[PDB]
Amino acid sequence: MKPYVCERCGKRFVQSSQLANHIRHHDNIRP
Ligand SMILES: [Zn+2]
């Protein structure tokens, strides 16, 4: 719940769980 933002791509979701995984799914893509 509540609008959450994955500013590292720009996609925003209200999912606290999906965000938590999404941000982690971001910081691994780097070298
Ligand atoms: Zn993202």
From Swiss-Prot:
Family from the record: Belongs to the krueppel C2H2-type zinc-finger protein family.
Tissue: Expressed in germinal center B-cells.
Oligomeric and partner information: Homooligomerizes (via the BTB/POZ domain), multimerization is required for DNA binding. Interacts (via the C-terminal zinc fingers) with GIF1; the interaction results in the recruitment of MYB to the CDKN1A/p21 and CDKN1B promoters and repression of transcription. Interacts with TRAF2, interfering with the binding of UBC13 to TRAF2, and inhibiting TRAF2 E3 ligase activity. Interacts with MYC (via the C-terminal helix-loop-helix motif); the interaction inhibits ZBTB17 transactivation and growth arrest activities and renders it insoluble in the nucleus.
Compartment(s) of residence: Nucleus
Source species of the chain: Homo sapiens
Tree of life domain: Eukaryota
Lineage of producing organism: Eukaryota, Metazoa, Chordata, Craniata, Vertebrata
Zinc finger residue ranges, C2H2-type: 4-26
Protein function: Transcription factor that can function as an activator or repressor depending on its binding partners, and by targeting negative regulators of cell cycle progression. Plays a critical role in early lymphocyte development, where it is essential to prevent apoptosis in lymphoid precursors, allowing them to survive in response to IL7 and undergo proper lineage commitment. Has been shown to bind to the promoters of adenovirus major late protein and cyclin D1 and activate transcription. Required for early embryonic development during gastrulation.
Protein name (database record): Zinc finger and BTB domain-containing protein 17
